[PDB]
């Protein structure tokens, strides 16, 4: 891995302090836009989480992968970060139950970072 | 018309009007072909998705149903707009065995699937195919 966005989304998910982020600046904006997202679509996350809660508990890796992949495909930058913001909690509970590396959803991540410039575009100029 | 060509095609598909007696027959068809296509190419996800929406389907918990289908909704793209309509279709066709359920119950979601008529129509006609 290199990219720049992808580096940022890992540290974001594996929850790394600023100043250990090689892409610290981009990281922030990710977390910003994300938080902002998490704000304006609160309903949707609540209902998604409860939905995945059986698969989250139970460590049902496949269903979680399939839930999160449904979204992506030829997604718009907007859902790409929704699914990202989702994947962030999804990973927080998985850590509390068995150490879980972001890399485990590397496919979801690839689906998130695809068309990287359009995504970086969105976090930077828009998502407000 | 408070109904666009596609919107009519969407409701008729969701309420399962017979091809015969649909004022947009040719669009119904396309719409139903691209849908069958998706479902088959992405059986994996649609399997896990219904499994995971099932509590809410049984129980008839319509709001969480909207919240769930709405998730990928505001920008989306002819692509996301069509997966969701494939799902909505399964969902509404078993909300009906439990109880009569009109596509109109999902008006909002439908507006979602259906904004950008010519982009969505384009996508069904030229591009949901890969031979």
PDB file of C-alpha atoms in Angstrom:
ATOM      1  CA  UNK A   1       0.000   0.000   0.000  1.00  0.00           C
ATOM      2  CA  UNK A   2       0.773   3.615  -0.711  1.00  0.00           C
ATOM      3  CA  UNK A   3      -2.021   5.725  -2.180  1.00  0.00           C
ATOM      4  CA  UNK A   4      -2.506   8.503   0.397  1.00  0.00           C
ATOM      5  CA  UNK A   5      -6.216   8.226   0.942  1.00  0.00           C
ATOM      6  CA  UNK A   6      -5.760   4.540   1.771  1.00  0.00           C
ATOM      7  CA  UNK A   7      -3.053   5.225   4.231  1.00  0.00           C
ATOM      8  CA  UNK A   8      -5.326   7.821   5.775  1.00  0.00           C
ATOM      9  CA  UNK A   9      -8.329   5.376   5.977  1.00  0.00           C
ATOM     10  CA  UNK A  10      -6.324   2.709   7.733  1.00  0.00           C
ATOM     11  CA  UNK A  11      -4.958   4.960  10.445  1.00  0.00           C
ATOM     12  CA  UNK A  12      -8.432   6.331  10.687  1.00  0.00           C
ATOM     13  CA  UNK A  13      -9.929   2.802  11.267  1.00  0.00           C
ATOM     14  CA  UNK A  14      -7.012   1.327  13.318  1.00  0.00           C
ATOM     15  CA  UNK A  15      -7.400   4.505  15.348  1.00  0.00           C
ATOM     16  CA  UNK A  16      -3.867   5.944  15.276  1.00  0.00           C
ATOM     17  CA  UNK A  17      -2.882   9.187  16.956  1.00  0.00           C
ATOM     18  CA  UNK A  18      -2.250  12.223  14.810  1.00  0.00           C
ATOM     19  CA  UNK A  19       1.566  12.580  14.391  1.00  0.00           C
ATOM     20  CA  UNK A  20       1.851   8.910  13.645  1.00  0.00           C
ATOM     21  CA  UNK A  21      -0.341   9.454  10.711  1.00  0.00           C
ATOM     22  CA  UNK A  22       1.930   9.870   7.724  1.00  0.00           C
ATOM     23  CA  UNK A  23      -1.078  11.590   6.109  1.00  0.00           C
ATOM     24  CA  UNK A  24      -2.135  13.445   9.244  1.00  0.00           C
ATOM     25  CA  UNK A  25      -3.761  16.294   7.450  1.00  0.00           C
ATOM     26  CA  UNK A  26      -5.940  14.187   5.216  1.00  0.00           C
ATOM     27  CA  UNK A  27      -6.769  12.061   8.244  1.00  0.00           C
ATOM     28  CA  UNK A  28      -8.385  14.972  10.040  1.00  0.00           C
ATOM     29  CA  UNK A  29     -10.662  15.921   7.153  1.00  0.00           C
ATOM     30  CA  UNK A  30     -11.748  12.220   6.907  1.00  0.00           C
ATOM     31  CA  UNK A  31     -12.724  12.195  10.592  1.00  0.00           C
ATOM     32  CA  UNK A  32     -14.358  15.652  10.166  1.00  0.00           C
ATOM     33  CA  UNK A  33     -16.527  14.802   7.152  1.00  0.00           C
ATOM     34  CA  UNK A  34     -17.180  11.483   8.891  1.00  0.00           C
ATOM     35  CA  UNK A  35     -18.385  13.079  12.166  1.00  0.00           C
ATOM     36  CA  UNK A  36     -20.453  15.494  10.093  1.00  0.00           C
ATOM     37  CA  UNK A  37     -21.944  12.530   8.281  1.00  0.00           C
ATOM     38  CA  UNK A  38     -22.559  10.633  11.566  1.00  0.00           C
ATOM     39  CA  UNK A  39     -24.417  13.784  12.662  1.00  0.00           C
ATOM     40  CA  UNK A  40     -26.797  14.434   9.751  1.00  0.00           C
ATOM     41  CA  UNK A  41     -27.829  10.773   9.173  1.00  0.00           C
ATOM     42  CA  UNK A  42     -27.971   9.558  12.773  1.00  0.00           C
ATOM     43  CA  UNK A  43     -31.238   7.594  12.119  1.00  0.00           C
ATOM     44  CA  UNK A  44     -29.574   5.530   9.418  1.00  0.00           C
ATOM     45  CA  UNK A  45     -26.619   4.419  11.540  1.00  0.00           C
ATOM     46  CA  UNK A  46     -28.727   3.541  14.530  1.00  0.00           C
ATOM     47  CA  UNK A  47     -30.901   1.372  12.353  1.00  0.00           C
ATOM     48  CA  UNK A  48     -27.981  -0.111  10.497  1.00  0.00           C
ATOM     49  CA  UNK A  49     -26.078  -0.956  13.700  1.00  0.00           C
ATOM     50  CA  UNK A  50     -29.049  -2.783  15.307  1.00  0.00           C
ATOM     51  CA  UNK A  51     -29.412  -4.557  12.026  1.00  0.00           C
ATOM     52  CA  UNK A  52     -25.765  -5.838  12.086  1.00  0.00           C
ATOM     53  CA  UNK A  53     -25.654  -6.441  15.840  1.00  0.00           C
ATOM     54  CA  UNK A  54     -26.223 -10.198  15.576  1.00  0.00           C
ATOM     55  CA  UNK A  55     -23.362 -10.478  13.012  1.00  0.00           C
ATOM     56  CA  UNK A  56     -21.153  -8.069  14.968  1.00  0.00           C
ATOM     57  CA  UNK A  57     -21.580 -10.245  18.180  1.00  0.00           C
ATOM     58  CA  UNK A  58     -21.124 -13.794  16.836  1.00  0.00           C
ATOM     59  CA  UNK A  59     -18.174 -12.343  14.774  1.00  0.00           C
ATOM     60  CA  UNK A  60     -19.969 -13.161  11.622  1.00  0.00           C
ATOM     61  CA  UNK A  61     -17.240 -11.907   9.285  1.00  0.00           C
ATOM     62  CA  UNK A  62     -18.994 -12.792   6.011  1.00  0.00           C
ATOM     63  CA  UNK A  63     -22.304 -11.097   6.704  1.00  0.00           C
ATOM     64  CA  UNK A  64     -20.582  -8.071   7.927  1.00  0.00           C
ATOM     65  CA  UNK A  65     -18.533  -8.052   4.643  1.00  0.00           C
ATOM     66  CA  UNK A  66     -21.651  -8.597   2.593  1.00  0.00           C
ATOM     67  CA  UNK A  67     -23.668  -5.945   4.450  1.00  0.00           C
ATOM     68  CA  UNK A  68     -20.964  -3.371   3.825  1.00  0.00           C
ATOM     69  CA  UNK A  69     -20.251  -4.349   0.277  1.00  0.00           C
ATOM     70  CA  UNK A  70     -23.875  -4.011  -0.723  1.00  0.00           C
ATOM     71  CA  UNK A  71     -23.536  -0.264  -0.371  1.00  0.00           C
ATOM     72  CA  UNK A  72     -20.169   0.285  -2.163  1.00  0.00           C
ATOM     73  CA  UNK A  73     -20.032  -1.123  -5.724  1.00  0.00           C
ATOM     74  CA  UNK A  74     -20.265   1.931  -8.032  1.00  0.00           C
ATOM     75  CA  UNK A  75     -20.958   4.210  -5.082  1.00  0.00           C
ATOM     76  CA  UNK A  76     -20.973   7.998  -4.940  1.00  0.00           C
ATOM     77  CA  UNK A  77     -18.312   9.608  -2.765  1.00  0.00           C
ATOM     78  CA  UNK A  78     -21.140  10.341  -0.259  1.00  0.00           C
ATOM     79  CA  UNK A  79     -22.102   6.711   0.565  1.00  0.00           C
ATOM     80  CA  UNK A  80     -18.412   5.770   0.366  1.00  0.00           C
ATOM     81  CA  UNK A  81     -17.929   7.767   3.582  1.00  0.00           C
ATOM     82  CA  UNK A  82     -21.191   6.678   5.129  1.00  0.00           C
ATOM     83  CA  UNK A  83     -20.080   3.067   4.707  1.00  0.00           C
ATOM     84  CA  UNK A  84     -16.742   4.280   6.028  1.00  0.00           C
ATOM     85  CA  UNK A  85     -18.229   5.957   9.067  1.00  0.00           C
ATOM     86  CA  UNK A  86     -20.202   2.726   9.645  1.00  0.00           C
ATOM     87  CA  UNK A  87     -17.116   0.514   9.227  1.00  0.00           C
ATOM     88  CA  UNK A  88     -15.526   2.678  11.933  1.00  0.00           C
ATOM     89  CA  UNK A  89     -17.988   1.596  14.695  1.00  0.00           C
ATOM     90  CA  UNK A  90     -18.335  -1.917  13.269  1.00  0.00           C
ATOM     91  CA  UNK A  91     -14.523  -2.165  13.882  1.00  0.00           C
ATOM     92  CA  UNK A  92     -14.715  -0.553  17.352  1.00  0.00           C
ATOM     93  CA  UNK A  93     -17.069  -3.350  18.633  1.00  0.00           C
ATOM     94  CA  UNK A  94     -15.042  -6.077  16.899  1.00  0.00           C
ATOM     95  CA  UNK A  95     -11.929  -4.867  18.806  1.00  0.00           C
ATOM     96  CA  UNK A  96     -13.738  -5.154  22.176  1.00  0.00           C
ATOM     97  CA  UNK A  97     -14.451  -8.805  21.390  1.00  0.00           C
ATOM     98  CA  UNK A  98     -11.302  -9.967  19.649  1.00  0.00           C
ATOM     99  CA  UNK A  99      -8.456  -7.831  18.354  1.00  0.00           C
ATOM    100  CA  UNK A 100      -9.446  -6.905  14.775  1.00  0.00           C
ATOM    101  CA  UNK A 101      -7.185  -5.215  12.245  1.00  0.00           C
ATOM    102  CA  UNK A 102      -8.764  -2.772   9.726  1.00  0.00           C
ATOM    103  CA  UNK A 103      -6.973  -4.922   7.112  1.00  0.00           C
ATOM    104  CA  UNK A 104      -9.667  -7.535   7.692  1.00  0.00           C
ATOM    105  CA  UNK A 105     -12.069  -5.449   5.625  1.00  0.00           C
ATOM    106  CA  UNK A 106      -9.435  -4.474   3.133  1.00  0.00           C
ATOM    107  CA  UNK A 107     -12.001  -5.176   0.356  1.00  0.00           C
ATOM    108  CA  UNK A 108     -14.562  -2.797   1.820  1.00  0.00           C
ATOM    109  CA  UNK A 109     -11.718  -0.294   2.194  1.00  0.00           C
ATOM    110  CA  UNK A 110     -10.663  -0.692  -1.476  1.00  0.00           C
ATOM    111  CA  UNK A 111     -14.276  -0.115  -2.337  1.00  0.00           C
ATOM    112  CA  UNK A 112     -14.170   3.022  -0.248  1.00  0.00           C
ATOM    113  CA  UNK A 113     -10.937   4.453  -1.683  1.00  0.00           C
ATOM    114  CA  UNK A 114     -11.557   3.571  -5.306  1.00  0.00           C
ATOM    115  CA  UNK A 115     -11.686   6.766  -7.452  1.00  0.00           C
ATOM    116  CA  UNK A 116      -9.579   8.343  -4.693  1.00  0.00           C
ATOM    117  CA  UNK A 117      -9.455  11.833  -6.133  1.00  0.00           C
ATOM    118  CA  UNK A 118     -13.203  12.262  -6.364  1.00  0.00           C
ATOM    119  CA  UNK A 119     -13.358  11.109  -2.643  1.00  0.00           C
ATOM    120  CA  UNK A 120     -10.586  13.443  -1.422  1.00  0.00           C
ATOM    121  CA  UNK A 121     -12.426  16.050  -3.543  1.00  0.00           C
ATOM    122  CA  UNK A 122     -15.636  15.490  -1.517  1.00  0.00           C
ATOM    123  CA  UNK A 123     -14.086  15.555   1.979  1.00  0.00           C
ATOM    124  CA  UNK A 124     -12.158  18.735   1.128  1.00  0.00           C
ATOM    125  CA  UNK A 125     -14.479  21.044  -0.899  1.00  0.00           C
ATOM    126  CA  UNK A 126     -17.840  19.575   0.133  1.00  0.00           C
ATOM    127  CA  UNK A 127     -19.399  17.442   2.923  1.00  0.00           C
ATOM    128  CA  UNK A 128     -20.696  20.527   4.653  1.00  0.00           C
TER     129      UNK A 128
ATOM    130  CA  UNK B   1     -48.150  14.798 -14.619  1.00  0.00           C
ATOM    131  CA  UNK B   2     -46.972  14.497 -10.990  1.00  0.00           C
ATOM    132  CA  UNK B   3     -45.679  11.172 -12.316  1.00  0.00           C
ATOM    133  CA  UNK B   4     -42.672  10.863 -14.601  1.00  0.00           C
ATOM    134  CA  UNK B   5     -42.512   7.976 -17.156  1.00  0.00           C
ATOM    135  CA  UNK B   6     -40.124   6.057 -14.835  1.00  0.00           C
ATOM    136  CA  UNK B   7     -41.952   6.734 -11.565  1.00  0.00           C
ATOM    137  CA  UNK B   8     -45.068   5.108 -13.065  1.00  0.00           C
ATOM    138  CA  UNK B   9     -42.898   2.188 -14.144  1.00  0.00           C
ATOM    139  CA  UNK B  10     -41.486   1.995 -10.644  1.00  0.00           C
ATOM    140  CA  UNK B  11     -44.863   1.823  -8.832  1.00  0.00           C
ATOM    141  CA  UNK B  12     -46.347  -0.619 -11.278  1.00  0.00           C
ATOM    142  CA  UNK B  13     -43.341  -2.869 -10.792  1.00  0.00           C
ATOM    143  CA  UNK B  14     -43.523  -2.554  -6.976  1.00  0.00           C
ATOM    144  CA  UNK B  15     -47.265  -3.177  -6.806  1.00  0.00           C
ATOM    145  CA  UNK B  16     -46.882  -5.987  -9.395  1.00  0.00           C
ATOM    146  CA  UNK B  17     -49.364  -4.691 -11.986  1.00  0.00           C
ATOM    147  CA  UNK B  18     -49.621  -7.149 -14.878  1.00  0.00           C
ATOM    148  CA  UNK B  19     -47.491  -6.103 -17.882  1.00  0.00           C
ATOM    149  CA  UNK B  20     -50.810  -6.164 -19.592  1.00  0.00           C
ATOM    150  CA  UNK B  21     -52.502  -2.867 -18.546  1.00  0.00           C
ATOM    151  CA  UNK B  22     -49.392  -0.859 -17.576  1.00  0.00           C
ATOM    152  CA  UNK B  23     -49.169   2.566 -19.321  1.00  0.00           C
ATOM    153  CA  UNK B  24     -45.362   2.135 -19.445  1.00  0.00           C
ATOM    154  CA  UNK B  25     -44.974  -1.518 -20.474  1.00  0.00           C
ATOM    155  CA  UNK B  26     -41.548  -1.234 -22.123  1.00  0.00           C
ATOM    156  CA  UNK B  27     -40.010   0.435 -19.110  1.00  0.00           C
ATOM    157  CA  UNK B  28     -41.523  -2.095 -16.711  1.00  0.00           C
ATOM    158  CA  UNK B  29     -39.783  -4.823 -18.699  1.00  0.00           C
ATOM    159  CA  UNK B  30     -36.338  -3.187 -18.830  1.00  0.00           C
ATOM    160  CA  UNK B  31     -36.652  -2.309 -15.110  1.00  0.00           C
ATOM    161  CA  UNK B  32     -37.562  -5.964 -14.328  1.00  0.00           C
ATOM    162  CA  UNK B  33     -34.705  -7.342 -16.464  1.00  0.00           C
ATOM    163  CA  UNK B  34     -32.001  -5.131 -14.864  1.00  0.00           C
ATOM    164  CA  UNK B  35     -33.518  -6.115 -11.477  1.00  0.00           C
ATOM    165  CA  UNK B  36     -33.431  -9.849 -12.165  1.00  0.00           C
ATOM    166  CA  UNK B  37     -29.913  -9.278 -13.397  1.00  0.00           C
ATOM    167  CA  UNK B  38     -28.712  -7.585 -10.178  1.00  0.00           C
ATOM    168  CA  UNK B  39     -30.354 -10.049  -7.808  1.00  0.00           C
ATOM    169  CA  UNK B  40     -28.616 -12.887  -9.679  1.00  0.00           C
ATOM    170  CA  UNK B  41     -25.185 -11.202  -9.936  1.00  0.00           C
ATOM    171  CA  UNK B  42     -25.323 -10.050  -6.282  1.00  0.00           C
ATOM    172  CA  UNK B  43     -27.270 -12.897  -4.682  1.00  0.00           C
ATOM    173  CA  UNK B  44     -24.593 -12.893  -1.896  1.00  0.00           C
ATOM    174  CA  UNK B  45     -25.468  -9.439  -0.441  1.00  0.00           C
ATOM    175  CA  UNK B  46     -29.240  -9.514  -1.034  1.00  0.00           C
ATOM    176  CA  UNK B  47     -29.198 -12.782   0.833  1.00  0.00           C
ATOM    177  CA  UNK B  48     -27.423 -11.367   3.830  1.00  0.00           C
ATOM    178  CA  UNK B  49     -29.420  -8.118   3.588  1.00  0.00           C
ATOM    179  CA  UNK B  50     -32.896  -9.656   3.771  1.00  0.00           C
ATOM    180  CA  UNK B  51     -31.641 -12.003   6.513  1.00  0.00           C
ATOM    181  CA  UNK B  52     -30.602  -8.947   8.450  1.00  0.00           C
ATOM    182  CA  UNK B  53     -33.705  -6.866   7.699  1.00  0.00           C
ATOM    183  CA  UNK B  54     -35.950  -9.804   8.508  1.00  0.00           C
ATOM    184  CA  UNK B  55     -36.679  -8.840  12.141  1.00  0.00           C
ATOM    185  CA  UNK B  56     -38.065  -5.519  10.769  1.00  0.00           C
ATOM    186  CA  UNK B  57     -40.041  -7.117   7.832  1.00  0.00           C
ATOM    187  CA  UNK B  58     -41.931  -9.555  10.094  1.00  0.00           C
ATOM    188  CA  UNK B  59     -42.981  -7.113  12.806  1.00  0.00           C
ATOM    189  CA  UNK B  60     -43.822  -4.695   9.974  1.00  0.00           C
ATOM    190  CA  UNK B  61     -41.444  -2.122  11.264  1.00  0.00           C
ATOM    191  CA  UNK B  62     -41.699   0.227   8.267  1.00  0.00           C
ATOM    192  CA  UNK B  63     -39.550   3.087   9.641  1.00  0.00           C
ATOM    193  CA  UNK B  64     -36.377   0.965  10.152  1.00  0.00           C
ATOM    194  CA  UNK B  65     -37.131  -0.404   6.746  1.00  0.00           C
ATOM    195  CA  UNK B  66     -36.956   3.191   5.304  1.00  0.00           C
ATOM    196  CA  UNK B  67     -33.880   4.046   7.444  1.00  0.00           C
ATOM    197  CA  UNK B  68     -32.139   0.831   6.146  1.00  0.00           C
ATOM    198  CA  UNK B  69     -33.041   1.353   2.390  1.00  0.00           C
ATOM    199  CA  UNK B  70     -32.446   5.109   2.699  1.00  0.00           C
ATOM    200  CA  UNK B  71     -28.888   4.578   3.846  1.00  0.00           C
ATOM    201  CA  UNK B  72     -27.257   4.568   0.393  1.00  0.00           C
ATOM    202  CA  UNK B  73     -29.737   7.030  -0.929  1.00  0.00           C
ATOM    203  CA  UNK B  74     -29.195  10.689  -1.306  1.00  0.00           C
ATOM    204  CA  UNK B  75     -26.525  10.921  -3.966  1.00  0.00           C
ATOM    205  CA  UNK B  76     -26.238   7.247  -4.964  1.00  0.00           C
ATOM    206  CA  UNK B  77     -26.055   6.745  -8.763  1.00  0.00           C
ATOM    207  CA  UNK B  78     -28.057   4.839 -11.345  1.00  0.00           C
ATOM    208  CA  UNK B  79     -26.222   1.814  -9.836  1.00  0.00           C
ATOM    209  CA  UNK B  80     -27.096   2.266  -6.140  1.00  0.00           C
ATOM    210  CA  UNK B  81     -30.545   3.464  -7.190  1.00  0.00           C
ATOM    211  CA  UNK B  82     -31.151   0.101  -8.799  1.00  0.00           C
ATOM    212  CA  UNK B  83     -29.897  -2.311  -6.101  1.00  0.00           C
ATOM    213  CA  UNK B  84     -32.130  -0.582  -3.615  1.00  0.00           C
ATOM    214  CA  UNK B  85     -35.159  -0.927  -5.910  1.00  0.00           C
ATOM    215  CA  UNK B  86     -34.338  -4.625  -6.254  1.00  0.00           C
ATOM    216  CA  UNK B  87     -34.368  -4.935  -2.445  1.00  0.00           C
ATOM    217  CA  UNK B  88     -37.438  -2.729  -2.016  1.00  0.00           C
ATOM    218  CA  UNK B  89     -39.145  -5.206  -4.381  1.00  0.00           C
ATOM    219  CA  UNK B  90     -38.380  -8.265  -2.196  1.00  0.00           C
ATOM    220  CA  UNK B  91     -39.285  -6.319   0.945  1.00  0.00           C
ATOM    221  CA  UNK B  92     -42.622  -5.075  -0.326  1.00  0.00           C
ATOM    222  CA  UNK B  93     -43.562  -8.439  -1.793  1.00  0.00           C
ATOM    223  CA  UNK B  94     -43.446 -10.093   1.700  1.00  0.00           C
ATOM    224  CA  UNK B  95     -44.807  -7.190   3.623  1.00  0.00           C
ATOM    225  CA  UNK B  96     -47.842  -8.166   1.473  1.00  0.00           C
ATOM    226  CA  UNK B  97     -48.176 -11.807   2.643  1.00  0.00           C
ATOM    227  CA  UNK B  98     -48.205 -10.368   6.182  1.00  0.00           C
ATOM    228  CA  UNK B  99     -50.590  -7.623   5.063  1.00  0.00           C
ATOM    229  CA  UNK B 100     -51.651  -5.375   2.136  1.00  0.00           C
ATOM    230  CA  UNK B 101     -48.862  -2.940   1.405  1.00  0.00           C
ATOM    231  CA  UNK B 102     -48.964  -0.370  -1.352  1.00  0.00           C
ATOM    232  CA  UNK B 103     -45.768   0.860  -3.016  1.00  0.00           C
ATOM    233  CA  UNK B 104     -47.051   4.337  -1.986  1.00  0.00           C
ATOM    234  CA  UNK B 105     -45.960   3.463   1.595  1.00  0.00           C
ATOM    235  CA  UNK B 106     -42.409   3.995   0.323  1.00  0.00           C
ATOM    236  CA  UNK B 107     -43.055   7.094  -1.746  1.00  0.00           C
ATOM    237  CA  UNK B 108     -39.918   8.791  -0.295  1.00  0.00           C
ATOM    238  CA  UNK B 109     -37.704   5.800  -1.091  1.00  0.00           C
ATOM    239  CA  UNK B 110     -39.197   5.693  -4.553  1.00  0.00           C
ATOM    240  CA  UNK B 111     -38.318   9.396  -5.169  1.00  0.00           C
ATOM    241  CA  UNK B 112     -34.850   8.290  -4.177  1.00  0.00           C
ATOM    242  CA  UNK B 113     -34.566   5.432  -6.698  1.00  0.00           C
ATOM    243  CA  UNK B 114     -36.061   7.749  -9.321  1.00  0.00           C
ATOM    244  CA  UNK B 115     -34.422  11.170  -9.219  1.00  0.00           C
ATOM    245  CA  UNK B 116     -32.421  11.701 -12.414  1.00  0.00           C
ATOM    246  CA  UNK B 117     -34.967   9.972 -14.644  1.00  0.00           C
ATOM    247  CA  UNK B 118     -32.787  10.002 -17.821  1.00  0.00           C
ATOM    248  CA  UNK B 119     -29.665   8.937 -15.982  1.00  0.00           C
ATOM    249  CA  UNK B 120     -31.535   5.963 -14.423  1.00  0.00           C
ATOM    250  CA  UNK B 121     -33.325   5.130 -17.654  1.00  0.00           C
ATOM    251  CA  UNK B 122     -30.006   5.442 -19.484  1.00  0.00           C
ATOM    252  CA  UNK B 123     -28.515   2.976 -17.061  1.00  0.00           C
ATOM    253  CA  UNK B 124     -31.265   0.362 -17.414  1.00  0.00           C
ATOM    254  CA  UNK B 125     -31.224   0.652 -21.256  1.00  0.00           C
ATOM    255  CA  UNK B 126     -27.561   0.967 -22.187  1.00  0.00           C
ATOM    256  CA  UNK B 127     -25.615  -0.248 -19.140  1.00  0.00           C
ATOM    257  CA  UNK B 128     -26.819  -2.852 -16.538  1.00  0.00           C
ATOM    258  CA  UNK B 129     -25.908  -5.621 -18.853  1.00  0.00           C
ATOM    259  CA  UNK B 130     -22.359  -6.967 -19.083  1.00  0.00           C
ATOM    260  CA  UNK B 131     -22.972  -9.835 -21.547  1.00  0.00           C
TER     261      UNK B 131
END
